[PDB]
Amino acid sequence: AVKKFKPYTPSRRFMTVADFSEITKTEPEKSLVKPLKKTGGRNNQGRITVRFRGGGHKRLYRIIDFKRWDKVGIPAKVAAIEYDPNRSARIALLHYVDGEKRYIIAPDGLQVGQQVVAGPDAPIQVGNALPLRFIPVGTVVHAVELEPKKGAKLARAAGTSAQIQGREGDYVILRLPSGELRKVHGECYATVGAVGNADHKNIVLGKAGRSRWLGRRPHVRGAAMNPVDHPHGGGEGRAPRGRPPASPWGWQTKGLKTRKRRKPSSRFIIARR
Amino acid sequence: MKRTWQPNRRKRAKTHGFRARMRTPGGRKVLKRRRQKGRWRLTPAVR
RNA sequence: GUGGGAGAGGGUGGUGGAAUUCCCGGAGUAGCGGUGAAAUGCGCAGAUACCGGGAGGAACGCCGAUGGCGAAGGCAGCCACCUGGUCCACCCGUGACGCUGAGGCGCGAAAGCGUGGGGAGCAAACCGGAUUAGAUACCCGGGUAGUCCACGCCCUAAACG
RNA sequence: GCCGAGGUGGUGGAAUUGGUAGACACGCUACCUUGAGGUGGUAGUGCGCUUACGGGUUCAAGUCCCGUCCUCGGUACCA
RNA sequence: CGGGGGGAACCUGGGGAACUGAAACAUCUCAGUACCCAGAGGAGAGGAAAGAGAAAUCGACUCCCUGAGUAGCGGCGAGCG
RNA sequence: GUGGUUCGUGGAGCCAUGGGGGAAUCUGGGCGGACCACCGCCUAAGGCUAAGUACUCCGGGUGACCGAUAGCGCACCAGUA
RNA sequence: CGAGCUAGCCCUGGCCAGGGUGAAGCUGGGGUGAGACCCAGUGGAGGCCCGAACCGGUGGGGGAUGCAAACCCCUCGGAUG
RNA sequence: CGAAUGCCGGCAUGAGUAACGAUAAAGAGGGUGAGAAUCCCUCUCGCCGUAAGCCCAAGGGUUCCUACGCAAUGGUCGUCAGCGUAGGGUUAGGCGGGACCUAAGGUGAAGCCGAAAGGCGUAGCCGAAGGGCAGCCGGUUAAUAUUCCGGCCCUUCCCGCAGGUGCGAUGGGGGGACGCUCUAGGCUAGGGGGACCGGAGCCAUGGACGAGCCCGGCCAGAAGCGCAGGGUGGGAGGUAGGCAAAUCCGCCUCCCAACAAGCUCUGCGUGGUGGGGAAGCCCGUACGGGUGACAACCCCCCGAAGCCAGGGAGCCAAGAAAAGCCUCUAAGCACAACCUGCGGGAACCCGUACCGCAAACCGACACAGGUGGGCGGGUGCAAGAGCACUCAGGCGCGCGGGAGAACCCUCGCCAAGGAACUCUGCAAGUUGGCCCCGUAACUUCGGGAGAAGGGGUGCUCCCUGGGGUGAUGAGCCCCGGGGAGCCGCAGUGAACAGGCUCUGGCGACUGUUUACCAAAAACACAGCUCUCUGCGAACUCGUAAGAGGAGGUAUAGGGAGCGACGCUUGCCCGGUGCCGGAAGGUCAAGGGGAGGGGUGCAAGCCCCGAACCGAAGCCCCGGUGAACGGCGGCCGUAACUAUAACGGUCCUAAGGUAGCGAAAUUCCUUGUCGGGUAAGUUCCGACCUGCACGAAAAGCGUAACGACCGGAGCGCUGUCUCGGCGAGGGACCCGGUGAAAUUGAACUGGCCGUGAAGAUGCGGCCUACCCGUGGCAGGACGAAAAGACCCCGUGGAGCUUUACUGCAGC
RNA sequence: UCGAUGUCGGCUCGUCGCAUCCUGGGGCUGAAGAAGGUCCCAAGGGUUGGGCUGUUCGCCCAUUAAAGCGGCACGCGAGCU
Ligand SMILES: [Mg+2]
Ligand SMILES: [Mg+2]
Ligand SMILES: [Mg+2]
Ligand SMILES: [Mg+2]
Ligand SMILES: [Mg+2]
Ligand SMILES: [Mg+2]
Ligand SMILES: [Mg+2]
Ligand SMILES: [Mg+2]
Ligand SMILES: [Mg+2]
Ligand SMILES: [Mg+2]
Ligand SMILES: [Mg+2]
Ligand SMILES: [Mg+2]
Ligand SMILES: [Mg+2]
Ligand SMILES: [Mg+2]
Ligand SMILES: [Mg+2]
Ligand SMILES: [Mg+2]
Ligand SMILES: [Mg+2]
Ligand SMILES: [Mg+2]
Ligand SMILES: [Mg+2]
Ligand SMILES: [Mg+2]
Ligand SMILES: [Mg+2]
Ligand SMILES: [Mg+2]
Ligand SMILES: [Mg+2]
Ligand SMILES: [Mg+2]
Ligand SMILES: [Mg+2]
Ligand SMILES: [Mg+2]
Ligand SMILES: [Mg+2]
Ligand SMILES: [Mg+2]
Ligand SMILES: [Mg+2]
Ligand SMILES: [Mg+2]
Ligand SMILES: [Mg+2]
Ligand SMILES: [Mg+2]
Ligand SMILES: [Mg+2]
Ligand SMILES: [Mg+2]
Ligand SMILES: [Mg+2]
Ligand SMILES: [Mg+2]
Ligand SMILES: [Mg+2]
Ligand SMILES: [Mg+2]
Ligand SMILES: [Mg+2]
Ligand SMILES: [Mg+2]
Ligand SMILES: [Mg+2]
Ligand SMILES: [Mg+2]
Ligand SMILES: [Mg+2]
Ligand SMILES: [Mg+2]
Ligand SMILES: [Mg+2]
Ligand SMILES: [Mg+2]
Ligand SMILES: [Mg+2]
Ligand SMILES: [Mg+2]
Ligand SMILES: [Mg+2]
Ligand SMILES: [Mg+2]
Ligand SMILES: [Mg+2]
Ligand SMILES: [Mg+2]
Ligand SMILES: [Mg+2]
Ligand SMILES: [Mg+2]
Ligand SMILES: [Mg+2]
Ligand SMILES: [Mg+2]
Ligand SMILES: [Mg+2]
Ligand SMILES: [Mg+2]
Ligand SMILES: [Mg+2]
Ligand SMILES: [Mg+2]
Ligand SMILES: [Mg+2]
Ligand SMILES: [Mg+2]
Ligand SMILES: [Mg+2]
Ligand SMILES: [Mg+2]
Ligand SMILES: [Mg+2]
Ligand SMILES: [Mg+2]
Ligand SMILES: [Mg+2]
Ligand SMILES: [Mg+2]
Ligand SMILES: [Mg+2]
Ligand SMILES: [Mg+2]
Ligand SMILES: [Mg+2]
Ligand SMILES: [Mg+2]
Ligand SMILES: [Mg+2]
Ligand SMILES: [Mg+2]
Ligand SMILES: [Mg+2]
Ligand SMILES: [Mg+2]
Ligand SMILES: [Mg+2]
Ligand SMILES: [Mg+2]
Ligand SMILES: [Mg+2]
Ligand SMILES: [Mg+2]
Ligand SMILES: [Mg+2]
Ligand SMILES: [Mg+2]
Ligand SMILES: [Mg+2]
Ligand SMILES: [Mg+2]
Ligand SMILES: [Mg+2]
Ligand SMILES: [Mg+2]
Ligand SMILES: [Mg+2]
Ligand SMILES: [Mg+2]
Ligand SMILES: [Mg+2]
Ligand SMILES: [Mg+2]
Ligand SMILES: [Mg+2]
Ligand SMILES: [Mg+2]
Ligand SMILES: [Mg+2]
Ligand SMILES: [Mg+2]
Ligand SMILES: [Mg+2]
Ligand SMILES: [Mg+2]
Ligand SMILES: [Mg+2]
Ligand SMILES: [Mg+2]
Ligand SMILES: [Mg+2]
Ligand SMILES: [Mg+2]
Ligand SMILES: [Mg+2]
Ligand SMILES: [Mg+2]
Ligand SMILES: [Mg+2]
Ligand SMILES: [Mg+2]
Ligand SMILES: [Mg+2]
Ligand SMILES: [Mg+2]
Ligand SMILES: [Mg+2]
Ligand SMILES: [Mg+2]
Ligand SMILES: [Mg+2]
Ligand SMILES: [Mg+2]
Ligand SMILES: [Mg+2]
Ligand SMILES: [Mg+2]
Ligand SMILES: [Mg+2]
Ligand SMILES: [Mg+2]
Ligand SMILES: [Mg+2]
Ligand SMILES: [Mg+2]
Ligand SMILES: [Mg+2]
Ligand SMILES: [Mg+2]
Ligand SMILES: [Mg+2]
Ligand SMILES: [Mg+2]
Ligand SMILES: [Mg+2]
Ligand SMILES: [Mg+2]
Ligand SMILES: [Mg+2]
Ligand SMILES: [Mg+2]
Ligand SMILES: [Mg+2]
Ligand SMILES: [Mg+2]
Ligand SMILES: [Mg+2]
Ligand SMILES: [Mg+2]
Ligand SMILES: [Mg+2]
Ligand SMILES: [Mg+2]
Ligand SMILES: [Mg+2]
Ligand SMILES: [Mg+2]
Ligand SMILES: [Mg+2]
Ligand SMILES: [Mg+2]
Ligand SMILES: [Mg+2]
Ligand SMILES: [Mg+2]
Ligand SMILES: [Mg+2]
Ligand SMILES: [Mg+2]
Ligand SMILES: [Mg+2]
Ligand SMILES: [Mg+2]
Ligand SMILES: [Mg+2]
Ligand SMILES: [Mg+2]
Ligand SMILES: [Mg+2]
Ligand SMILES: [Mg+2]
Ligand SMILES: [Mg+2]
Ligand SMILES: [Mg+2]
Ligand SMILES: [Mg+2]
Ligand SMILES: [Mg+2]
Ligand SMILES: [Mg+2]
Ligand SMILES: [Mg+2]
Ligand SMILES: [Mg+2]
Ligand SMILES: [Mg+2]
Ligand SMILES: [Mg+2]
Ligand SMILES: [Mg+2]
Ligand SMILES: [Mg+2]
Ligand SMILES: [Mg+2]
Ligand SMILES: [Mg+2]
Ligand SMILES: [Mg+2]
Ligand SMILES: [Mg+2]
Ligand SMILES: [Mg+2]
Ligand SMILES: [Mg+2]
Ligand SMILES: [Mg+2]
Ligand SMILES: [Mg+2]
Ligand SMILES: [Mg+2]
Ligand SMILES: [Mg+2]
Ligand SMILES: [Mg+2]
Ligand SMILES: [Mg+2]
Ligand SMILES: [Mg+2]
Ligand SMILES: [Mg+2]
Ligand SMILES: [Mg+2]
Ligand SMILES: [Mg+2]
Ligand SMILES: [Mg+2]
Ligand SMILES: [Mg+2]
Ligand SMILES: [Mg+2]
Ligand SMILES: [Mg+2]
Ligand SMILES: [Mg+2]
Ligand SMILES: [Mg+2]
Ligand SMILES: [Mg+2]
Ligand SMILES: [Mg+2]
Ligand SMILES: [Mg+2]
Ligand SMILES: [Mg+2]
Ligand SMILES: [Mg+2]
Ligand SMILES: [Mg+2]
Ligand SMILES: [Mg+2]
Ligand SMILES: [Mg+2]
Ligand SMILES: [Mg+2]
Ligand SMILES: [Mg+2]
Ligand SMILES: [Mg+2]
Ligand SMILES: [Mg+2]
Ligand SMILES: [Mg+2]
Ligand SMILES: [Mg+2]
């Protein structure tokens, strides 16, 4: 869990690569990949709408199953645990008995050979997925639906999870990985346990190039621009912001809240980040 | 040292050529303009 | 060796109620706190005291002893798993196979350090109220590290009989 | 060299033209508490002269003005 | 059966600047101009009063002359009309 | 809320209309410069309609128009080299 | 009207003589209660090293109506990212 | 028209001036011709040879070939030509494209959006240097040739026969189908050597008739076979998935081979046949042709980066699509249809000349610049695409001849000295490859390191070890070892090839940057912190639809600072920002109508309007520092003095902690002291009076790194004392060609004056025959550019904000 | 002089003034001698090499007969830096 390196170069000093022990299969499931279009952060008009992107490895997209409920009651055996370049986590390849192959995003604690199933039935065990209403309160759970049948949305990122705090009416009270407190509808599926590859946050990029491999290009500071360019540009040697700090588009960037206030989902929230 | 003209026949038809002009309203007017000025060539040679 | 015994001895995983604190709701009004006496602070934007609902962290009351276990440091709600030492009995086996121990190795309260977490109460530093000639203190109101978990360091002590 | 605010008790510091030993402190002096000092309590700070200089305004000038000295603050850029 | 597309300038509709002027400049001006777009033609718009507006009056619409730089409008300015 | 008109919010009507409300059919409705009365004018919410007008790619006629540095950019194989 | 120059991104291809250093892992031995670890071999990592191609443009000289509207010479930087 | 740096045109001056475009280089003979340095052929000489040779792709588009031409184009000449005129020349079922596929992207029925114009968009369609697809060797033309011819092979389509089979698709499945580094075994291209094989001819000038010397000893090739290698399990049973179906694929279970065993595919070998085939001599070829020959046609060795190819391994950053192809079934049809084999017929459009690192492309030029892929021989040097010479082949760069001044450029060498040069060792020089010995502080333990500093280096002889290929052997190739000796000043004998050390600053580091005056201490960067964001996310672009974010989900995404790492990062919440706050106050439209007015006989119509309810915002209450930001003054005091641990007092929101400090910050300033030097405004170490450091616009440190900027030493030098000589290319003279800015007109001297204040031009005086060449720059307020500095203009523009007024956005 | 009169310093090359740093010739002296001090005449010649700083200047090391001061667009950039 987290490879380190001798310092036989600079930057090989602080580098850290993930441990790949959990990985069973070294090439993906041909059935389950589509190629994906790399945007470079350019939207349909050829305009950059997210800065500092592009470069980075050719990448095959793995189509992963975010609705477990098409297969209700059909068991499946976990066939392998794989590397997915498109996400923080690991994907499990698993074979349904009725012969369909799907990718689940791998819970921690899941191992190859395990027997897994989703439905309002089903044991409470790692990898099984149920309607939220049927998980015992106090469970920790991942890959959670936010509206019934709409796809899993919350807690898909390596090492994240969420927790059932209580039930009220048609809805259950979820603690999100943000610490926000949310009612989610009881009918929403979720699959028990946390996401794993939790050691993920401790990997140390370690050198400039290695940030490029991830397709994120250099990020140049406001301060280091001119005034045509940023609210912080201009000013001889350095200078401080000399105004409350701002985005290139000139809104305030320290503490100013951007959530819409009159948003209808406010009726469903109790907490923050 | 590398100058601004790097002839590419495909580029030239694709960019300034006839169908290109006729695709856009702006371009239809170029043609309209040139035709009315009496140009011998409404659009570059290319090939 | 065999047969037994006591115990907060250690490690892992669970799990319980009490209380504090914070949140919602209900009810309810002008003060609560705090001290040597006060002030700072909290409170008609509805505090305190009361009832209900919930979240969370830490510590385990009575049993509890001038008691027990451990080589030491140390160990105290309950339950399970894994495990150390130790005493008694019958007098069975090996046959001096012993004692000590420079170095070496390991363990080592608290505080401190690193990377993650976690953070209720307490609280170095820090702010404020008092006291005082003054008070960078004692007392009061606040309060961050830390106190807790994991992994890794540190290796000290009135580490004392 | 150039514009802004200042010079007052022993000290630090106040005052709209109406002064006044002059706010308020702290020095200090007399007594008191103490065996003695300090802390602490009680009641006063010039010999009928001065608020930097000296010279106008006013019925009155620490207060407004005029220049002189000193302080402090700011400035002396393109060259 | 029709449409499509082209046409010097002219017409109507949708949209629509700035320089400049005001001896600065914001209302105002330049100006519903330049221009972009859609449509029409040999012309196009308009047209047969829910009109004018003071006389008991005129009678559809266009165009010219004139009323008249009048009536008015206007940082009651420049100016517009 | 705006646009049009000479009308720039002015006493601001008339014509038009993006938004809200929302009638009546001659004893009905619009207008005559806020509004009210009186006296008049006119009949909205369907449509078409020659001529008189604008222009000049084109043909002609005519010039106190130019005469090859002029007159169209081009008198000439020019929107060419 | 332009991204046939330049800048970034996307898709699909290609290029990088040779030499040097010798990471993890593995294997063996040592070590130990079991380890950590040590040594030897092997192994062949890296915005590692020297250096052509390719990419630059460091200092100096020359050129300055130039060979050239940015060049030439010597020297220098990177060269599996 | 006389002036507008006027416009158009013509013609001057500079001037027979500068230049004639790489310093790779020329000489003569012969020919042709009106005319020859410049065309042609010979011989000699020089230059390129990872190219300055050869192939391809772009782009160009007749430049190709030949005949006849020389006005112009050619930097001179021209008989020549890429130039003028004319004629000729480009041949494909297999090469490249298209009657194939799909990528980004484009387009776009369905659909959505937008005043119009239009924007978007699923399927589909288009789109290639990627995937798929069937030709190899030779000959021939003046000029084309995988195109024509010759020989040997192959593809599709149509029709037929034979044999086989549930046939059948735009639908299901498989496959296609993949990164990067390293890399095994076998091959091949390619190359070296041979006493073996074939071959004209040769014996010079002292020696050699010799296992002499110089030349050559291959290419393509179906089936078959051989060798190397790729791919691949076989049968049954069930079956709920692969939007219908399936016998296929998937999945569960049972039995057989575990192995290429077999089946299958590709590579190379060999192959029937076919084809080439040197030096040299001769023919005259402008270029080839004849002969050598009836050629020989073999052995060994070196060996890819290429081939077998979906090979192997490791790694993290996790590595296109679709069709061809195989499979499965659906309708439908089963005389059809498809499969396999043989046969016959059918097989279209476009390109092909030539240039192609360049005189034919991009650079106004026959321009020292730019331009993607492939091949790129030999020897030596550690290797190599490096460097020196050289093959094939290709060039001597489209002005020449002389002379041998100054000056310049490029180059070589120097007595003694050795940085004294100078802002600065700038420049140059020193060093230099490889083998061995050796190698410090400090360090993040890797480094520092090529630290430093040393020794070796040729050739001949003897002995000698191991490898590869051959067999276990010679032969050939590779890596060594020991001994004795030869020669010169010197053996990496020429060419390519680090000068080193100490010490500060700044930035951690490799990177990036002002194309064209700045490469940096700037930007970036891993990493730290803050903040926003629950997902139809925030945020960005768009009027919108849509889109990016992301087919991502708080270990994620956006914004902002800081900038590896170590140790750290104080106090102030008054103001500003943001954040929280159900009360309070004020607050627009709207609500409400107390009352008041206009008019009317009136019923009424119309107008105004108080109270009161009525958002956000502001006010107000709080919070907030890695938010914007800020972080005091005066007086006194110790038993020498001096200083003040201590005290007093004014003010503040609070009065700068650690650490650092004459600093990339210190004005005074060359502060003072120490170190260095004979001497040190710089440098280093201190002190602290910090004009005016200070903690993420981070503080203080830090090994390693730097074409960064200071300072010092050694080494070594023409940098210098201080210059001298020599070389080439220019400059000079001659023949050819022949520009330029500038130019009121010129008959254009010095001094003292004078003058709009700096006179060839006015006064006086002095000096002075006319005209040129080569030189120098003091003057013509010399040229150039309507001064960029400065002001002015109610000139402009970019930028800012608590200037004004708007708009988007919220 | 802004339709342009390049600006400190250094190098190079100088030339001139004398208000003389030295050398020559003098008066006075509080000149014994030697050495000076002052003022007088005198522009023929001469007037070093280094450390530091861009520096002018200046300070400093080592010498010197001596280590002069000025002007020439703070002489001199179609002469260099
Ligand atoms: Mg587009
Ligand atoms: Mg940045
Ligand atoms: Mg900047
Ligand atoms: Mg911009
Ligand atoms: Mg801005
Ligand atoms: Mg700023
Ligand atoms: Mg600054
Ligand atoms: Mg700046
Ligand atoms: Mg290039
Ligand atoms: Mg051009
Ligand atoms: Mg092309
Ligand atoms: Mg024509
Ligand atoms: Mg006890
Ligand atoms: Mg005990
Ligand atoms: Mg036990
Ligand atoms: Mg016995
Ligand atoms: Mg301990
Ligand atoms: Mg502890
Ligand atoms: Mg006391
Ligand atoms: Mg507390
Ligand atoms: Mg004890
Ligand atoms: Mg006594
Ligand atoms: Mg007094
Ligand atoms: Mg008085
Ligand atoms: Mg200024
Ligand atoms: Mg039309
Ligand atoms: Mg209109
Ligand atoms: Mg219009
Ligand atoms: Mg329209
Ligand atoms: Mg104006
Ligand atoms: Mg004006
Ligand atoms: Mg103006
Ligand atoms: Mg108007
Ligand atoms: Mg007609
Ligand atoms: Mg008509
Ligand atoms: Mg009509
Ligand atoms: Mg009409
Ligand atoms: Mg009509
Ligand atoms: Mg009529
Ligand atoms: Mg008025
Ligand atoms: Mg108007
Ligand atoms: Mg209007
Ligand atoms: Mg107005
Ligand atoms: Mg009106
Ligand atoms: Mg009316
Ligand atoms: Mg309406
Ligand atoms: Mg009406
Ligand atoms: Mg009317
Ligand atoms: Mg009417
Ligand atoms: Mg008409
Ligand atoms: Mg006509
Ligand atoms: Mg003419
Ligand atoms: Mg003409
Ligand atoms: Mg004439
Ligand atoms: Mg003429
Ligand atoms: Mg003309
Ligand atoms: Mg013509
Ligand atoms: Mg481009
Ligand atoms: Mg490298
Ligand atoms: Mg290198
Ligand atoms: Mg250079
Ligand atoms: Mg020059
Ligand atoms: Mg890359
Ligand atoms: Mg001129
Ligand atoms: Mg003229
Ligand atoms: Mg002439
Ligand atoms: Mg001349
Ligand atoms: Mg000359
Ligand atoms: Mg010449
Ligand atoms: Mg001859
Ligand atoms: Mg000749
Ligand atoms: Mg070669
Ligand atoms: Mg071509
Ligand atoms: Mg051309
Ligand atoms: Mg031609
Ligand atoms: Mg040819
Ligand atoms: Mg030719
Ligand atoms: Mg000619
Ligand atoms: Mg000629
Ligand atoms: Mg020709
Ligand atoms: Mg066809
Ligand atoms: Mg297609
Ligand atoms: Mg489109
Ligand atoms: Mg449509
Ligand atoms: Mg459309
Ligand atoms: Mg293709
Ligand atoms: Mg292809
Ligand atoms: Mg083909
Ligand atoms: Mg073939
Ligand atoms: Mg051939
Ligand atoms: Mg088929
Ligand atoms: Mg002989
Ligand atoms: Mg063969
Ligand atoms: Mg099915
Ligand atoms: Mg494969
Ligand atoms: Mg492989
Ligand atoms: Mg298709
Ligand atoms: Mg079938
Ligand atoms: Mg059927
Ligand atoms: Mg056939
Ligand atoms: Mg051809
Ligand atoms: Mg070239
Ligand atoms: Mg050529
Ligand atoms: Mg030439
Ligand atoms: Mg060229
Ligand atoms: Mg050219
Ligand atoms: Mg190239
Ligand atoms: Mg080669
Ligand atoms: Mg070598
Ligand atoms: Mg090669
Ligand atoms: Mg070479
Ligand atoms: Mg040759
Ligand atoms: Mg020649
Ligand atoms: Mg030449
Ligand atoms: Mg010599
Ligand atoms: Mg010498
Ligand atoms: Mg010597
Ligand atoms: Mg020396
Ligand atoms: Mg000097
Ligand atoms: Mg140098
Ligand atoms: Mg040392
Ligand atoms: Mg060192
Ligand atoms: Mg080392
Ligand atoms: Mg060495
Ligand atoms: Mg030797
Ligand atoms: Mg020798
Ligand atoms: Mg050498
Ligand atoms: Mg050499
Ligand atoms: Mg060398
Ligand atoms: Mg080197
Ligand atoms: Mg410094
Ligand atoms: Mg750097
Ligand atoms: Mg740093
Ligand atoms: Mg660098
Ligand atoms: Mg930069
Ligand atoms: Mg630059
Ligand atoms: Mg520039
Ligand atoms: Mg650099
Ligand atoms: Mg540069
Ligand atoms: Mg979206
Ligand atoms: Mg928007
Ligand atoms: Mg999206
Ligand atoms: Mg997406
Ligand atoms: Mg920074
Ligand atoms: Mg920094
Ligand atoms: Mg504050
Ligand atoms: Mg605040
Ligand atoms: Mg506050
Ligand atoms: Mg309120
Ligand atoms: Mg109302
Ligand atoms: Mg009334
Ligand atoms: Mg409010
Ligand atoms: Mg407040
Ligand atoms: Mg701070
Ligand atoms: Mg104080
Ligand atoms: Mg300070
Ligand atoms: Mg210190
Ligand atoms: Mg200091
Ligand atoms: Mg100093
Ligand atoms: Mg400072
Ligand atoms: Mg220092
Ligand atoms: Mg600073
Ligand atoms: Mg800061
Ligand atoms: Mg520092
Ligand atoms: Mg650098
Ligand atoms: Mg010299
Ligand atoms: Mg010479
Ligand atoms: Mg004369
Ligand atoms: Mg004069
Ligand atoms: Mg005269
Ligand atoms: Mg002359
Ligand atoms: Mg001159
Ligand atoms: Mg001059
Ligand atoms: Mg001017
Ligand atoms: Mg003004
Ligand atoms: Mg202005
Ligand atoms: Mg001037
Ligand atoms: Mg002039
Ligand atoms: Mg001039
Ligand atoms: Mg004299
Ligand atoms: Mg004398
Ligand atoms: Mg004497
Ligand atoms: Mg004497
Ligand atoms: Mg003299
Ligand atoms: Mg003199
Ligand atoms: Mg001197
Ligand atoms: Mg210096
Ligand atoms: Mg000085
Ligand atoms: Mg000066
Ligand atoms: Mg001067
Ligand atoms: Mg100068």
Author numbering:
A (entry chain 11): 2 to 274
B (entry chain P8): 1 to 47
Task: List sentences from the manuscript.
Here we present several high-resolution structures of Thermus thermophilus 70S ribosomes programmed by templates carrying missense errors. Our data provide evidence that steric complementarity and shape acceptance but not the number of hydrogen bonds between the decoding centre and a codon–anticodon duplex play the discriminatory role during decoding.
We have successfully solved the structure of the 70S ribosome in two post-incorporation states. In this complex, the GAG anticodon of tRNA2Leu formed two simultaneous G·U mismatches with the first and third positions of the phenylalanine UUU codon in the peptidyl-tRNA-binding site (P-site). The structures of both states revealed the remarkable finding that a G·U mismatch mimics a canonical Watson–Crick pair at either of the first two positions of the codon–anticodon duplex. Further analysis showed that the codon–anticodon duplexes containing G·U mismatches have an overall geometry that is identical to that of the corresponding cognate duplexes consisting of standard Watson–Crick pairs. Although the 3 Å resolution of our models is not sufficient to distinguish between the two tautomeric forms, the observed Watson–Crick-like geometries for the G·U pairs can be rationalized by the presence of enol tautomers in the P-site. In an analogous fashion to the mRNA P/A-kink131420, the mRNA constraints between the E-codon and P-codon1114 together with the tight ribosome grip surrounding the tRNA anticodon stem-loop1214 contribute to the fixing of the P-site codon–anticodon mini-helix in place. Thus, this fixation would restrain the first codon nucleotide from the shift necessary to form a wobble pair.
